[PDB]
Design an enzyme around this catalytic site. Sequence first.
Site, PDB file in Angstrom:
ATOM      1  N   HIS A  42      -0.080   2.335   5.051  1.00 22.22           N
ATOM      2  CA  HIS A  42       1.018   1.380   4.995  1.00 22.22           C
ATOM      3  C   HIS A  42       0.934   0.316   6.081  1.00 22.22           C
ATOM      4  O   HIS A  42       1.659  -0.681   6.004  1.00 22.22           O
ATOM      5  CB  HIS A  42       2.359   2.112   5.090  1.00 22.22           C
ATOM      6  CG  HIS A  42       3.497   1.369   4.459  1.00 22.22           C
ATOM      7  ND1 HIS A  42       3.334   0.154   3.831  1.00 22.22           N
ATOM      8  CD2 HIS A  42       4.813   1.672   4.358  1.00 22.22           C
ATOM      9  CE1 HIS A  42       4.501  -0.262   3.371  1.00 22.22           C
ATOM     10  NE2 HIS A  42       5.414   0.642   3.677  1.00 22.22           N
ATOM     11  N   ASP A 102       1.175  -2.912   1.744  1.00 17.70           N
ATOM     12  CA  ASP A 102       2.584  -2.692   1.464  1.00 17.70           C
ATOM     13  C   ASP A 102       2.750  -2.149   0.050  1.00 17.70           C
ATOM     14  O   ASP A 102       1.783  -1.979  -0.696  1.00 17.70           O
ATOM     15  CB  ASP A 102       3.388  -3.986   1.644  1.00 17.70           C
ATOM     16  CG  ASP A 102       2.927  -5.092   0.719  1.00 17.70           C
ATOM     17  OD1 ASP A 102       1.721  -5.139   0.406  1.00 17.70           O
ATOM     18  OD2 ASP A 102       3.771  -5.913   0.305  1.00 17.70           O
ATOM     19  N   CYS A 149     -16.312   3.289   0.542  1.00 18.20           N
ATOM     20  CA  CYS A 149     -15.188   2.376   0.685  1.00 18.20           C
ATOM     21  C   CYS A 149     -13.957   2.786  -0.110  1.00 18.20           C
ATOM     22  O   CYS A 149     -12.878   2.238   0.140  1.00 18.20           O
ATOM     23  CB  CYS A 149     -15.591   0.954   0.266  1.00 18.20           C
ATOM     24  SG  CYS A 149     -16.995   0.273   1.177  1.00 18.20           S
TER      25      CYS A 149
END
Lengths: 247, 247, 247, 62
Positions: free
Chosen positions: B220, B224, B164
Amino acid sequence: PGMLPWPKVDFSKFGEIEEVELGRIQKISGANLSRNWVMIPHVTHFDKTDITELEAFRKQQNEEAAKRKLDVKITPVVFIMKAVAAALEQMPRFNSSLSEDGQRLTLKKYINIGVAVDTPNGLVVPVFKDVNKKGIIELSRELMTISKKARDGKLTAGEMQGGCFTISSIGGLGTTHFAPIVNAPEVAILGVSKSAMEPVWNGKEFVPRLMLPISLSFDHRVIDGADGARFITIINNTLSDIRRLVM
Amino acid sequence: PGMLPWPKVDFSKFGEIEEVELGRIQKISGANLSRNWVMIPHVTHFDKTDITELEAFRKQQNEEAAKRKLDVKITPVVFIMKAVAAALEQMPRFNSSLSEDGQRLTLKKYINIGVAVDTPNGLVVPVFKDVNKKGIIELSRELMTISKKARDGKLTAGEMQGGCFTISSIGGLGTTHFAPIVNAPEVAILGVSKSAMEPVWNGKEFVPRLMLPISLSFDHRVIDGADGARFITIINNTLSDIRRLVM
Amino acid sequence: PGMLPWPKVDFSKFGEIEEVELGRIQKISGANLSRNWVMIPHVTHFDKTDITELEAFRKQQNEEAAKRKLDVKITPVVFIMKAVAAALEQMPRFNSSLSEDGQRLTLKKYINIGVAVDTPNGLVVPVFKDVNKKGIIELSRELMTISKKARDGKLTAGEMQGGCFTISSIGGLGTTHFAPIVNAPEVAILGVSKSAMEPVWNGKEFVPRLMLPISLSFDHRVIDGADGARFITIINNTLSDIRRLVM
Amino acid sequence: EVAILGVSKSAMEPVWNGKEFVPRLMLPISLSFDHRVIDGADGARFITIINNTLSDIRRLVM
């Protein structure tokens, strides 16, 4: 693919505008950069080399050759080219080119280095042949001749081909770090910024050392992080202790 | 699309060449990296954490466990993994994966962390399961066993899945900063360079602190700039003051 | 193209998962970012400006306007906007937009600057019109009003259009450097991190200066490395010596 | 219960580090236990473990 189209906004509704065309060279450069960006994954590695003995020795050589009357100017980019050539000698993998299909790698035995030269029309990349079998004075003379030819806008097509490792130096303008774009068919590209007097820890207290920041972009399809780190460390060691060029 | 084709230049006209093929693993890695680069927008955030008490405490633990005879070596990457697990606990959004269509986000409740291990064939990413419910000694022992298994080239397919948050450590080679590439289906990736003794301002005068640079790339589309900055700041705070792992 | 598909791994086999949908604004932002990343080659330039007189003068102005009772707060982002407007005045090329086909460049004579504002839903980019013909107090008042409007979630569509140079400030969270993504149709974008007290060499010994790191991403199709370096150096000079705003 | 721990008031006392005494905020702790199940050595080891954990709290994760 299925991405959104480019935003089309009427810029004339906010103020005066002036639409102009682009030159053929600019269009070709833009297309090449776009293709390289969309086809080559960039993994930029940043480092700072300790250049204090090299700059002092360069100024010493310049002041001692002024007396001998040679009309030759020695620039640090020559030493950068020599270090890059030595690193390519140590690691042949960076001196290669990946095929279009990405399955065959064409290793290179020769070492020709491109150099970024500023011109009124932008930047050009003349190529110097056989950088690993030339001296500092000869390389400096060839670089001066090539720069004079380029600033006059008389570069030929034969001097713009055969490169293996583009070097982009922008230390005369500014910036402390920048990530360049690898240009095909080359695998790696080195960028040089401006040198600054920074405190470096020697073991007891900080001392002022003229550190030069160097960035290195490369294609992640052929070069992994470890190989790039080793390559940039070899360049750092060669630039910090130039005496390794003979050892 | 409509981009220019890859430049095909006969490299045999400039010197000796040697064309060789690539292995299956290399081709798969290159294809995955290309797909990730062309599908994931990378916004790399750089930071430097103050690691002076952590390294000293690690060496203290090593020297105090040598007396007790345990044959366990403690590495800073274990503490980095613990900090990453704590940050994932605080922010579940980074512990997720974006779907192929980019419309559905699969949040994850478990925390398994991949670690970059150097092998003669390149780099591998073995995955450690449940890093948020294990101690330092157990994690160090598992890491030593996994590194010994990987250096022998005996890693299985079951130990290469379930990750992960890949962590790439290249502090043993060089570089002061580098921007890694996020690998699908993971959202973020952390890169660690070499630690250096730098002057840090405390309020009255500069003091030498062992700063470790950390870079963080992320997609992105899901994260953010503000969330990435907060995440890397949480990691920085956890690494600078490890005592927060219990608080 | 012919890339590999996105990896589909059943995350439910490793632990609990929770799949959730994404909002319309998030999907639009992700699509725009993906399109910009796959269509715009980014060449990020990093720099650090010396901001010691500017911060002191800003605090002096705040403390002298508190006595006069004005209810106006002055932030460094206003000075950053003024410096960006001055740099756009000096170089009209950055104040433009490339067409979809990449053959026509629409130069702009007006200067409207977007500003990154943090909201509970993420980040927004309100645009201020005519930054080169406004004072510090007026810009600060407009910025305060716009921030209050945005934090209440009442921004209109007319205040989200017309920008020419997005500025992303994340100094209140962390990070020492970060590379933003240029958003179409804009050519360049400036990112600001946190200011730190660093030793700077003046010629005799290091002195503590409040350095602010600034990053600048731009489209390499229209802007080359030299122009970007000159632009960021102009911004650095304007921010280090604000008195150049009248000279 | 087998054992019980008592905590008094912390005081700034001089502690020898190897060269000279330094002021350290020492906290006194007492530990009573049943001697039928716990002997002196086990109690000493237990209170020493508590002392080490309290003096260096970072051991809580190690």
